[PDB]
Design a protein around this ligand. Structure first.
Ligand code: F6C
Ligand code: CLA
Ligand code: CLA
Ligand code: CLA
Ligand code: CLA
Ligand code: CLA
Ligand code: CLA
Ligand code: CLA
Ligand code: LHG
Ligand code: BCR
Ligand code: SF4
Ligand code: SF4
Ligand code: CA
Lengths: 75, 80, 31, 742, 42, 170
């Protein structure tokens, strides 16, 4: 009835990190990057706004991917 | 129309001109061979493409070549 | 089980998309 | 001047009926078109390729749609040995009720056609179980054809037309085709085979509603990530496994059994999934060899231009080849005719491989027992392969006419084979003459011995080399304990490794004398193999001679200035009929058709004698030519030509009609092939007189009636000969097999 | 049994009209359109 | 600044931006023009009678059907086909009476509007009253014939059905 969904184990932290790094890989190709604010470009290219946006999209992708993989047995 | 080309191996024997059924060819002065003549093809709009001129040529290889081209009502030999 | 009339009419209506895409490609290739 | 054709001003000025015929047979020759640049040529070819893929997808969609709407797919999966698959329905209003009854089987309410393409077996082996599955596949392919059409239209738009440097990229394309058209596609096919095909083979239904639910293996991606991959080859399907049911089933998804499933007599689906996976990995690896824009990789051009000279850094397996392969990369890459004639040779070898492999190792369930389907599929692909091999040499000649550069190819391999072309042609001529004299004389001696009442005095030569190659694979049919026939040999045991886990399954199949995998061969096989050798050699003689003499010979030194197709060079110099390089592909089409006739006649009679149980009919009857005439052509014609008789019509009536239709078309060919142009031009002149002088006949030809040209009528007669030759044999092979073995 | 053409399949009235259209109703218009296309003048 | 400085899909009609029309894909593409300009109303060279004849044939043919299916006589085949036939006949005769009186009222001296001699309407090419009378006669002939052809195909639907099923080959 409900889509499985596991708790949290090293397998869940891996998927949440591999999805946060894919977010960093694709978020290097944005425009108006390193937009000062705080730590203007002190996050390997990205500033603090861009790091927070990349990690927020990474968390979103991670929650979606983790719940999908937990639904279908793989996780 | 067909393209009839005459090359410098021509010897001015006139046999291509005599063999033409449609009068495409004539002889012009040359001083490039000892006959003093070379064939020419001005009325090549009349050429049917029978290649009798090429059969009549004695030089090896031929000093006259016919290249069959765009077909008109004259080169197709049509009386209708 | 066998196909329905609506399944045949779906096919007939959906093949109008390659049917007019093919005419567009034929006229774009310029006869 | 008409506006048609828009691609040639010279054909618009044509006042005769020749321009309509020459606008149809020069329409796809984009190179010789008005105002054609190289870039515009490549772009037009790209869009034409897209429209072609759209036609292929629409064709497959239509096949799927007609089996799903008018076939008996769901009724045939219940018993795929005693039910004839149905192609589609007949709606000929001209049938009498006797033909409506003849084309209606027991389980059908309308006239239908029996399918002989084998798509039922293929769709049943890959998971498709219902008419809804077939309809979904058909609608997907309809939409995919629409996608290909939109892609082709899109890449003709100015912002989207690729540049010429993109089309010349021979390193990026090879990487993406090796890894991504051959690798990723085969990896996806392995994915389907373990997610749909193998589960549905065991009885579980997997669709686009429960495939995310159902795992392909009980331990889902646990053995793969952990590294223990041998778990996927554990618990395979047992010998007493019944296809599409769970009785005898296993759980393995990638296993390497070898041989055949003993109940479907086909290749194992675990073996095919493992195959496509081991192919996908190797092809994804191979698509990483050439550099595109990441620094790492090879350059193909630097590899080819490095085969110039002697030494270990140079071309050492033939150091006396001059400039070696310098200019060969540019001959390949710049010439689209070189590429097309090269790729047609590759595809024509692969299509013959397809034909030679799918009868000996049947890949689909119960297709070895559909005899007419097996015969039709083999003959289909062997004729397609012969045509592809004919077009390979056609475009090899067209390259040497149009794109060959004698200075860019100065003293390399291509210019080095053009130099000594008389040695190649005379040695093909010698092999052809030797094979022909000996094979014909052996057959005629056997005819004269059998006719004079001495079948024992026939010259019967055994194919001892091929019988020995049958023995080195593990055939105990003869007394040759060779490599895999010897059970404790170095090849059989794999001494350090003992990992040939294919050996018992493969020797269960090769020794099984009921399949087609390495059929038993005798004296009647040796002669027909020598006839096939003669046929391939003479076809190669004609094609090689016309390709190498394309640029000019001693009879016409400047033949490259006249083109690829031209009638002749007149009646001078003795006469120059059929002197062009196009006329060699013309003259070799007859020999290709004859050779494939010999090939398919051999295959069909060999298999008819095997399937009937009377293999001695082909054995002691194929060594002389009256046995071929009488026990094959005359004997297996009695059911076909009685398809309609003065007493009634059975369902072989269309095959009898198409048999006669092919005879008619083949005979009509000889009119274009024997009678030549001037006869018909004078006849048409009398007809023009008759029409202008008849009252009440108000029509008049806008374009002047002329006889078909010399090259045109050669092509027309060849097309007729081909169409009638294919129709006659297709009607005979479907009816001589579908009647004996319904 | 079979005194006339039948269809034991869905929308079996579609051959009844599709075979006339594809084979002897629309072809002569298509032939006329193609003839007018190949005989039009510049 | 941007007013006809960039090149867009929508152009002025006939290159004239002060005309009251636009060149859109529906009135100016090659497919739309190839279809419309070759319709009998616009096909080049045709006499008005042949234009009208083909228009009428096509029109009287389909005008039979709505009353055959939906009319007051629809409960019975024979009466339904007759009601459709006479509906097509009446609509044809009314439409052709209208064509005749349009030509009678319009072409009086130099006409007003699109049939004036100075008119530039490309979409109305029957400039003479003789064209309009030949059109009226042709539309009448063709439409009455197409109506009775549809009527004859619907009356013999039992025969046309047995023919197209091969039931006549017994
Ligand atoms: C239209 C136009 C025209 C006209 C008018 O108009 C005509 C006419 C004549 C007369 C005069 C005579 C007589 C008649 C008879 O008897 O016979 C029949 C035939 C036919 C064909 C018939 C025809 C008719 C028409 C065609 C009708 C039409 C139909 C419809 C229209 C169709 C439809 C269309 C759609 C679109 C498809 C004739 C003839 C001859 N043809 Mg002759 N035509 C013509 C066309 C054509 C073409 C295309 C071709 C190619 C194929 C040819 C061919 C021929 C030959 C081989 C010969 C002969 O032998 C003959 C003779 O010479 O004597 C002596 N020719 N023609
Ligand atoms: C004699 C050799 C031969 C044989 C046995 C076949 C057999 C087959 N072909 Mg074919 N084919 C051939 C030569 C042959 N082909 C050649 C040389 C070409 C290149 C033009 C083709 C191109 C072709 C196409 C496009 C298709 C096939 C298809 C088929 C399959 C279904 C038709 C059938 O059941 O049987 C009957 C076999 C006959 C030869 C009957 C005679 C009909 C005559 C030949 C019509 C003349 C047209 C032309 C010459 C070739 C048409 C072949 C095809 C339409 C049957 C069948 C396995 C169909 C398929 O793939 O199924 C899914 C299909 O769509 N083939
Ligand atoms: C790791 C790959 C992965 C896999 C196997 C899945 C699988 C699934 N997703 Mg998911 N998803 C993913 C990544 C993935 N997702 C990512 C990267 C995002 C973006 C954040 C999402 C956002 C998403 C949403 C919003 C939903 C799903 C839902 C689903 C389920 C519905 C099946 C379907 O219709 O399609 C399915 C089991 C749907 C569902 O059924 O929720 C339980 C649904 O609501 N996904
Ligand atoms: C190319 C594949 C293909 C082929 C060879 C056929 C062949 C046939 N069809 Mg079929 N059809 C197809 C695809 C195909 N169909 C698809 C994808 C659909 C779903 C829309 C249909 C829907 C359909 C219906 C409703 C009917 C047929 C019928 C028929 C039969 C009579 C001819 C006819 O009425 O045409 C009718 C065709 C259509 C209504 C649509 C055709 C759309 C296809 C994709 C056009 C293909 C164009 C092709 C790729 C271009 C080739 C270029 C040229 C060189 C040949 C005939 C055996 C009749 C029948 O069953 O006889 C008993 C019938 O009435 N077909
Ligand atoms: C991964 C990326 C990718 C992929 C998938 C493709 C795919 C394709 N390209 Mg492309 N290309 C790419 C990248 C890619 N390309 C790049 C980066 C460039 C720039 C250098 C190009 C430049 C390019 C050009 C210029 C052209 C293509 C063309 C094609 C098509 C030709 C092959 C074909 O027709 O289908 C079929 C081939 C296969 C399915 C694999 C064949 C393997 C063998 C022969 C068959 C498989 C064997 C097996 C037994 C089959 C059994 C199946 C049976 C049971 C049904 C094809 C769809 C041609 C095209 O335009 O088409 C529109 C073409 O002209 N490409
Ligand atoms: C990712 C791709 C892939 C995967 C999942 C497998 C998986 C497997 N292979 Mg394999 N193989 C591959 C690629 C792959 N192969 C390639 C590219 C080659 C060519 C060199 C091979 C050649 C190969 C051989 C010769 C054998 C296997 C065998 C096996 C099975 C057990 C082997 C093991 O434990 O490890 C296993 C299911 C063994 C097997 O199937 O035992 C019955 C076996 O003998 N493979
Ligand atoms: C990938 C495959 C492929 C491609 C793209 C080409 C492409 C080309 N070839 Mg070709 N070729 C091929 C394979 C291929 N070939 C094969 C397999 C053969 C051997 C049969 C040939 C032998 C060949 C020759 C000898 C020539 C070409 C030529 C050409 C060029 C122009 C073709 C043309 O005129 O337009 C269109 C032509 C047609 C539309 C003719 C169609 C009629 C054909 C011949 C038969 C039709 C079947 C019939 C109607 C079935 C009806 C039966 C039934 C209804 C009763 C073009 C670049 C010509 C060239 O390059 O000029 C220098 C040239 O002379 N080819
Ligand atoms: C039964 C008909 C027939 C026969 C026997 C031949 C025989 C031959 N062809 Mg031919 N061909 C044929 C039909 C035939 N063709 C047709 C219909 C075409 C299409 C036009 C061609 C087109 C063709 C071409 C284009 C070529 C040939 C070539 C050859 C010769 C090479 C094969 C060989 O040496 O075998 C051995 C010789 C024989 C079998 C001849 C018979 C010997 C007799 C019986 C001796 C006894 C005589 C005594 C009086 C009794 C050979 C003489 C090729 C060639 O010349 O190779 C050098 C060549 O290039 N053929
Ligand atoms: C398959 C189902 C039944 C088939 C019936 C229809 C068959 C095709 C009829 C041809 C009419 C097209 C006339 C174009 C008229 C037109 O727009 O002319 C465009 C072009 C030349 O036009 P011009 O540039 O001269 O245009 C100038 C004038 O229009 C005004 O300036 O002609 C062509 O491209 C010929 C190539 C078409 C080749 C068609 C083959 C492609 C198959 C298409 C499949 C159609 C399916 C449609 C239904 C889904
Ligand atoms: C736009 C379009 C469309 C549509 C079309 C349509 C709309 C249709 C139709 C149609 C129609 C609507 C047709 C028709 C017709 C007709 C006919 C075919 C006629 C006829 C007739 C007749 C033949 C008559 C006769 C007669 C006479 C005249 C006299 C006396 C009587 C009689 C009867 C004898 C579509 C989308 C599809 C696509 C393409 C384009
Ligand atoms: S081909 Fe014939 S017509 Fe032409 S120039 Fe030569 S001889 Fe004269
Ligand atoms: S026949 Fe030849 S050599 Fe003699 S004049 Fe003519 S072209 Fe010259
Ligand atoms: Ca009523």
């Amino acid at each position: 009835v409900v889509p499985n969904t596991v708790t949290w184990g090293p397998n869940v932290a891996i998927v949440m990190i591999i999805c946060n790094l894919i977010a960093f890989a694709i978020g290097k190709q944005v425009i108006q990057i390193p937009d000062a604010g705080p730590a203007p470009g002190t996050f390997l290219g990205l500033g603090l706004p861009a790091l927070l946006g990349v990690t927020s999209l990474g968390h979103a992708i991670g929650v979606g991917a983790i719940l999908g993989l937990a639904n279908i047995g793989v996780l | 129309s067909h393209s009839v080309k005459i090359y410098d191996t021509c010897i001015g024997c006139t046999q291509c001109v005599r063999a033409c059924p449609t009068d495409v060819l004539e002889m012009v002065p040359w001083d490039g061979c000892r006959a003093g003549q070379i064939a020419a093809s001005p009325r090549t709009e009349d050429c049917v493409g029978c290649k009798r001129c090429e059969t009549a040529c004695p030089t090896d290889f031929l000093s006259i070549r016919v290249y069959l081209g765009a077909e008109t009502s004259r080169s197709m030999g049509l009386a209708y | 089980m066998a196909l329905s009339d609506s399944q045949i009419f779906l096919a007939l209506a959906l093949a109008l998309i390659p049917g007019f895409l093919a005419l567009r490609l034929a006229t774009e290739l310029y006869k | 001047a008409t506006k048609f054709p828009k691609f040639s001003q010279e054909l618009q000025q044509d006042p005769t009926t020749r321009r309509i015929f020459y606008s149809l047979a020069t329409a796809h020759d984009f190179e010789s078109h008005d105002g054609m640049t190289e870039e515009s040529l490549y772009q037009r070819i790209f869009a034409s390729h897209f429209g072609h893929l759209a036609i292929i997808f629409l064709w497959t969609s239509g096949i799927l749609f007609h089996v799903a709407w008018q076939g008996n797919f769901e009724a045939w999966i219940k018993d795929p040995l005693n039910i004839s698959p149905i192609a589609h329905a007949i709606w000929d209003p001209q049938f009498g009720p006797a033909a409506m009854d003849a084309f209606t089987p027991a389980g059908a309410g309308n006239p239908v056609n029996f399918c002989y393409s084998g798509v039922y077996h293929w769709w049943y082996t890959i998971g498709l179980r219902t008419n809804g599955d077939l309809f979904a596949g058909a609608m997907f392919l309809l939409l995919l054809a629409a996608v290909m059409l939109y892609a082709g239209w899109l890449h003709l738009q100015p912002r989207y037309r690729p540049s010429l440097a993109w089309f010349k990229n021979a390193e990026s394309r090879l990487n993406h085709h090796l890894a991504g058209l051959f690798g990723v596609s085969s990896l996806a096919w392995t994915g389907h085979l373990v997610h749909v095909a193998i589960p549905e083979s065991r009885g579980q239904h997997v669709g686009w509603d429960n495939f995310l639910s159902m795992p392909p293996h009980p331990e889902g991606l646990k053995p793969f990530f952990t590294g223990n991959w041998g778990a996927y080859a554990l618990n395979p399907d047992t010998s007493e496994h019944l296809f599409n049911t769970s009785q005898g089933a296993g759980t393995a998804i990638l296993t390497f059994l070898g041989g055949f499933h003993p109940q479907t007599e086909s290749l194992w689906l675990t073996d095919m999934a493992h195959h496509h996976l081991a192919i996908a990995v190797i092809f994804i690896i191979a698509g990483h060899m050439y550099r595109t824009n990441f620094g790492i990789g090879h350059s193909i051009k630097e590899m080819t231009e490095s085969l110039q000279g002697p030494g270990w850094t140079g071309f050492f397996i033939a150091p006396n080849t001059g400039r070696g392969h310098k200019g060969i990369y540019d001959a390949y890459n710049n010439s689209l005719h070189f590429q097309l004639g090269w790729h047609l040779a590759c595809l024509g070898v692969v299509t013959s491989l397809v034909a030679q492999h799918m009868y000996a190792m049947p890949p689909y369930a119960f297709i070895a027992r559909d005899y007419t389907t097996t015969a039709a599929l083999y003959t289909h692909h062997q004729y397609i392969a012969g045509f592809l091999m004919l077009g390979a040499f056609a475009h090899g000649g067209i390259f040497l006419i149009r794109d060959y550069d004698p200075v860019a190819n100065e003293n390399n391999v291509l210019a080095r084979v053009l130099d000594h072309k008389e040695a190649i042609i005379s040695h093909l001529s010698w092999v052809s003459l030797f094979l022909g004299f000996h094979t014909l004389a052996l057959y005629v001696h056997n005819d004269c011995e059998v006719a004079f009442g001495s079948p024992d005095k026939q010259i019967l030569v055994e194919p001892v080399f091929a019988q020995w190659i049958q023995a080195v694979h593990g055939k105990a049919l003869y007394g040759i304990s060779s490599l895999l026939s010897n059970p404790d040999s170095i090849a059989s045991t794999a001494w350090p490794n003992h990992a040939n886990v294919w050996l018992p399954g493969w020797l269960e199949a090769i020794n099984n004398g009921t399949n087609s995998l390495f059929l038993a061969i005798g004296p009647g096989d040796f002669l027909v193999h020598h006839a096939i050798a003669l046929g391939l050699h003479v076809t190669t003689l004609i094609l090689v001679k016309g390709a190498l003499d394309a640029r000019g010979s001693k009879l016409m030194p400047d033949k490259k200035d006249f083109g690829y197709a031209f009638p002749c060079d007149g009646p001078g110099r003795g006469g120059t009929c059929d002197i062009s390089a196009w006329d060699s592909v013309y003259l070799a089409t007859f020999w290709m058709l004859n050779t494939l006739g010999w090939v398919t006649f051999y295959w069909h009679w060999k298999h008819l004698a095997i399937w009937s149980g009377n293999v001695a009919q082909f054995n002691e009857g194929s060594t002389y030519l009256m046995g071929w005439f009488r026990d094959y052509l005359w004997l297996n014609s009695a059911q076909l030509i009685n398809g309609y008789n003065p007493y009634g019509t059975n369902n072989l009536a269309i095959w009898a009609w198409i048999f006669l239709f092919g005879h008619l078309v083949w005979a009509i060919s000889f009119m274009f092939l024997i009678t030549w142009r001037g006869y018909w031009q004078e006849l048409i002149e009398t007809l023009m007189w008759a029409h202008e002088n008849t009252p009440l006949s108000f029509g008049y030809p806008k374009d002047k009636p002329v006889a078909l040209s010399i090259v045109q009528a050669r092509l027309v007669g060849l097309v007729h000969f081909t169409v009638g030759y294919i129709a006659t044999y297709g009607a005979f092979l479907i009816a001589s097999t579908g009647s004996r073995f319904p | 049994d079979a005194t006339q053409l039948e269809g034991a399949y869905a929308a079996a009235w579609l051959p009844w009209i599709m075979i006339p259209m594809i084979t002897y109703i629309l072809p002569f218009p298509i032939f006329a359109i193609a003839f007018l296309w190949i005989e039009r003048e510049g | 600044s941007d007013a006809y400085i960039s090149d867009d899909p929508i152009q002025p009609y006939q290159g004239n931006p002060q005309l009251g029309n636009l060149a859109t894909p529906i009135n100016s593409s090659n497919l739309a023009k190839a279809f419309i300009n070759n319709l009998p109303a616009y096909r080049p060279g045709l006499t008005p009678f042949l234009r009208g004849l083909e228009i009428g044939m096509a029109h009287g043919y389909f005008l039979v059907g709505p009353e055959v299916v939906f009319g007051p006589l629809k409960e019975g085949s024979h009466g339904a086909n007759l009601s459709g036939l006479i509906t097509a006949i009446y609509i044809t005769v009314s439409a052709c009476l209208g064509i005749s009186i349009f030509a009678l009222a319009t072409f009086q001296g130099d006409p007003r509007g699109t049939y004036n001699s100075h008119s530039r309407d490309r979409l109305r090419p029957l400039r003479k009253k003789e064209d309009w009378y030949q059109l009226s006669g042709g539309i009448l002939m063709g439409s009455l014939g197409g109506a009775i052809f549809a009527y004859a195909l619907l009356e013999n639907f039992e025969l046309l059905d047995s023919i197209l099923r091969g039931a006549v080959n017994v």
